Structures are given as C-alpha cells and as structure tokens.
Amino acid sequence: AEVTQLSNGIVVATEHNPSAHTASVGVVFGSGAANENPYNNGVSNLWKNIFLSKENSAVAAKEGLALSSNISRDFQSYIVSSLPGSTDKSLDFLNQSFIQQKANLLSSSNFEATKKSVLKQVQDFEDNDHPNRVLEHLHSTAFQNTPLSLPTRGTLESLENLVVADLESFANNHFLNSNAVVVGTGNIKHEDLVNSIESKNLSLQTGTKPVLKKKAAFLGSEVRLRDDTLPKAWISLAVEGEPVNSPNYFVAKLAAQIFGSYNAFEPASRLQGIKLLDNIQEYQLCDNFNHFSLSYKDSGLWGFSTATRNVTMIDDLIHFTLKQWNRLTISVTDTEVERAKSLLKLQLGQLYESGNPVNDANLLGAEVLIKGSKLSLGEAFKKIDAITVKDVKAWAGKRLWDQDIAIAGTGQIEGLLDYMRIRSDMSMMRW
Amino acid sequence: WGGFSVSNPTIQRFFALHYLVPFIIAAMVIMHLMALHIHGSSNPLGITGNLDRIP
Numbered sequence: 162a163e164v165t166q167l168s169n170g171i172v173v174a175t176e177h178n179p180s181a182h183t184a185s186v187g188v189v190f191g192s193g194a195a196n197e198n199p200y201n202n203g204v205s206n207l208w209k210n211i212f213l214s215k216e217n218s219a220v221a222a223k224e225g226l227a228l229s230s231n232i233s234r235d236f237q238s239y240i241v242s243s244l245p246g247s248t249d250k251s252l253d254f255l256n257q258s259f260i261q262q263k264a265n266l267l268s269s270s271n272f273e274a275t276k277k278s279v280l281k282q283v284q285d286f287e288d289n290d291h292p293n294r295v296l297e298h299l300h301s302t303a304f305q306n307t308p309l310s311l312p313t314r315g316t317l318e319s320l321e322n323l324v325v326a327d328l329e330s331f332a333n334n335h336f337l338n339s340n341a342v343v344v345g346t347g348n349i350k351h352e353d354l355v356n357s358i359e360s361k362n363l364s365l366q367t368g369t370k371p372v373l374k375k376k377a378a379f380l381g382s383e384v385r386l387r388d389d390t391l392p393k394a395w396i397s398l399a400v401e402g403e404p405v406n407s408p409n410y411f412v413a414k415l416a417a418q419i420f421g422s423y424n425a426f427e428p429a430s431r432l433q434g435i436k437l438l439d440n441i442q443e444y445q446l447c448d449n450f451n452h453f454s455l456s457y458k459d460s461g462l463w464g465f466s467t468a469t470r471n472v473t474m475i476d477d478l479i480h481f482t483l484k485q486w487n488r489l490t491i492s493v494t495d496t497e498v499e500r501a502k503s504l505l506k507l508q509l510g511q512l513y514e515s516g517n518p519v520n521d522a523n524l525l526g527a528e529v530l531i532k533g534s535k536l537s538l539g540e541a542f543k544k545i546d547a548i549t550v551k552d553v554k555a556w557a558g559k560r561l562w563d564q565d566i567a568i569a570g571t572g573q574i575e576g577l578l579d580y581m582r583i584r585s586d587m588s589m590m591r592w
Numbered sequence: 593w594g595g596f597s598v599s600n601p602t603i604q605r606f607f608a609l610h611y612l613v614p615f616i617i618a619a620m621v622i623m624h625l626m627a628l629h630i631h632g633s634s635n636p637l638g639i640t641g642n643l644d645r646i647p
C-alpha cells in the first residue's frame with residue numbers, strides 16, 4: 162500500500178508487499194513507439210526481442226532469473242523476475258546487459274535470427290489478430306501524422322529495412338538516465354534496493370536529453386480495411402479521450418464502465434445492468450463489444466470496439482450504441498453512475514493488485530514517469546466515489562456531444578455506413 | 593365530342609378527365625419507382641454500382 166520513490170543520481174521507485182513469493186526488478190524508459198519515426202518504426206519492439214533472445218535469456222535462466230519486456234506508446238520496459246533472495250543478482254544481469262553487453266547482444270548472427278522472428282511475429286498479427294489489428298489502426302487514423310499514430314510492433318516495411326545502427330542510434334538517444342526510472346516490485350524494501358544501486362557508481366551518458374517533437378492531435382477520420390473473406394466484422398470507434406493526469410481521467414473511465422463490455426455467449430453477461438443490452442439482444446447485433454478509456458501522455462481515446470456476424474444489421478449496432486452514448490449528456494441516471502462506480506473499483510482493484518509483480522512494475526513505472534508519483538488505490542476510490550451525474554454530463558457534453566469520431570474496421574464491413582451517418586448520431590434533434 | 597362538334601358536353605367532359613388523369617399518372621409513377629427499386633439506378637460509367645454505394 163506504500164509508494165516509495167527517491168532520487169540520488171537515478172530515480173528509484175518501489176512498492177513492497179511481503180506476502181509476495183517473488184520480486185521483480187527492471188528499468189522503465191520514458192520513451193516508446195510514440196518517440197519513433199515512420200521510418201525506424203519498430204526499433205523499440207526489436208530491442209525488446211533481443212533482450213529476450215535465446216542467448217541473453219539462457220544466461221538469466223542458469224542464474225534462475227526470468228525475463229520480461231513491454232513496448233508501449235509513451236514508455237518502454239525491461240524486467241527481470243527472481244526470488245526475494247536473489248534481488249541482487251537481478252541488478253547484475255540488468256547492468257551486464259545495458260552496459261557490458263550493449264554490444265554483445267547486437268551481433269550479426271543474433272540480430273538476423275531475431276529480425277526474422279519479429280517479422281514472422283508482426284506478420285502473424287496483421288494476418289490474424291483482427292480485433293487488436295483494428296484497434297491499432299484506430300490509433301493510426303485518429304492520430305495520423307502525429308506520435309500516437311505509430312503502431313507499437315512497428316510496420317513490416319520499416320522493420321525489414323532496419324539495421325544494427327538504428328538500434329544503437331535509438332538506444333543512445335532514449336536509453337538515457339534522465340529518461341529512465343528503475344522500478345522494483347515484489348517484496349523487497351525500498352532501502353534494500355536503493356543501496357545496491359547507490360553502491361555501484363558510474364553515470365554513463367549523464368546530462369544527455371532525448372530529442373523533442375510535435376504535440377499529438379486527434380483528427381476525426383476513418384480507415385476501412387474491408388475483407389469479405391473474413392467471417393465477421395470487427396470495428397472500433399472513438400472520440401478524443403483524456404490524457405493521463407487529466408481532471409476528468411476518472412470521469413472518462415467511469416463513463417466507459419456504464420456501457421462496459423459484453424459477450425453474447427456468456428449467460429451472466431446478457432444479464433448486466435446495461436440499457437444498451439435491451440436493444441442489441443433482440444436481433445443479436447453482435448457477438449461482443451467493450452468500451453474503453455485509453456489514456457496517454459498527450460491525449461487519449463474514448464469509445465468502443467465490437468465484433469459481429471450479423472453483417473446486414475451493423476447499422477443498428479452502431480445506431481443503438483451511439484444513442485446510448487447520447488444519454489450521458491442528457492439523461493444518465495443516478496443508479497447507472499452508482500453501478501459504474503462499484504464496477505470501476507472492482508476492475509481498478511483487480512489491475513493494481515494482481516498476483517503478479519511484473520504487472521505491478523509496468524503500472525508503477527508508467528505512472529511515475531509521467532507525474533513523478535503514483536496515486537494510491539485508496540486515493541483513486543475517493544475520487545471515483547466523488548463523481549456526480551452532473552460531472553458525467555459536463556464531461557460528455559464536451560467530449561461526446563456533436564464531436565468528431567475516428568473509425569476503423571476490417572472483415573465484412575459493407576454494412577458499416579458512411580462517416581457522416583455515424584457522425585450525425587453523435588447527437589439528437591431538439592426543439 | 594358528345595355531339596355534332598366541340599361544344600359544351602366536350603369541355604365539361606375534358607375538365608372531368610383533366611382532373612382524373614393526374615391521379616393515374618401518380619399511380620404509374622409508383623409503378624415506375626417500384627421497377628427502379630429492384631435494380632437501383634444506373635451510373636455514368638455504365639457499369640455495376642454494387643462495389644461502392646452511399647445512402
């Protein structure tokens with residue numbers, strides 16, 4: 162329940178939990194796919210893949226350490242998990258790979274075998290993971306010609322034309338000290354870790370700052386990846402959401418909980434206290450849907466994603482869903498808000514407190530990099546419970562009502578009507 | 593004519609008929625739209641419109 166963080170030469174952030182059997186240690190850099198270019202796009206993902214290379218991974222396996230990495234938009238992270246006792250040997254492997262082997266991982270035999278793996282990896286994604294593929298393209302069109310548009314896994318064309326020098330160039334511009342935070346989760350104490358860190362000196366590229374860019378911006382638009390050979394239609398639609406560290410950060414997430422997620426095959430899901438379900442179940446407008454409030458450093462996306470085999474009624478799916486969202490500005494009820502608060506706490510809890518320290522590190526790391534600290538789970542609940550119907554209405558009237566949208570879809574989307582028809586539904590006629 | 597030449601009977605029946613026909617035309621227009629609906633409009637290229645329609 163304690164979020165301890167101190168700075169000496171490097172910023173150290175930890176969160177202890179004695180009941181945890183293992184401990185995870187790692188470095189989280191304040192730069193991700195949002196820092197790349199259209200041409201070196203996929204370099205971060207490539208780094209992650211060599212860090213988990215058979216060679217580097219075997220060295221950690223002998224020592225009894227497990228490797229894990231995650232490439233996001235605003236950040237990047239390299240994590241090593243171990244037993245509570247080997248909390249020192251994780252730091253040896255961390256330093257040995259980011260300073261000593263910052264040239265042994267980049268061999269012309271390791272790099273090629275890895276490049277061939279991320280190529281089959283990113284290709285498999287585009288060929289089969291339609292829901293995530295669609296969600297990735299949603300960011301692509303919504304934030305076109307802006308940092309948030311670049312996909313995390315990179316594109317096949319920028320990937321196959323990438324070389325060892327590109328990795329180095331990126332590493333020497335972002336893997337800096339002022340653009341880093343060392344994180345530790347599990348059971349180890351803050352004072353326990355900071356000592357092993359403040360022990361080993363050496364700055365290594367100190368005072369150096371990463372390159373700057375241009376601010377991210379939402380552009381109402383769409384990308385339609387029609388493919389009549391797929392057995393379904395997958396669509397994602399959203400408005401400009403909230404950036405992390407926004408006053409309405411929670412109002413937005415609550416609003417998404419009101420409509421929540423659905424799965425037509427799960428008996429219990431068909432019974433949720435969601436008004437939209439009365440409309441969509443009559444003719445079974447979809448197999449599933451899920452709302453989200455994605456937040457990043459400069460912006461975010463608020464909307465929903467859905468999958469359906471009812472290809473001749475896609476317009477009803479979109480129409481009923483948008484009519485429900487209209488409600489947030491004009492008629493959302495106290496009980497809908499209250500139901501959302503309870504369910505938001507339950508999901509926010511299950512995230513911030515899972516039985517896995519690697520998840521804790523990513524959540525902690527990502528937060529401290531943006532606001533310099535982490536809001537305690539109990540602090541969130543105070544903010545969540547304080548939200549009134551009046552708040553949700555003021556938010557919706559600014560973010561949802563008669564606002565541009567961004568759309569992306571693949572599969573049998575002939576039935577997804579034109580942009581203007583969808584856009585017109587972002588409001589209602591009144592006297 | 594209703595007689596020996598164009599006279600009163602003629603003009604009175606022509607007004608009655610002038611009032612009637614517009615309604616028969618209206619019924620024919622509906623039949624015209626019905627035939628139009630089953631195949632839809634054509635376009636300036638003279639080819640199929642099935643690959644790209646807008647409401």
Ligand code: HEC
Nearest residue numbers: 617618620621622624625627628629631632633634635636
């Ligand atoms: C002798 C020919 C002809 C006459 C007279 C005619 N139509 Fe048409 N109409 C057509 C044809 C053929 C089309 C299909 C055009 C196409 O899609 O290429 C058509 C299409 C239409 C359309 C669709 C839009 C358009 O302009 O293509 C409407 C509406 C329509 N007609 C209304 C009428 C009405 C109302 C009348 C008369 C009161 C009328 N038509 C008289 C031949 C005719």
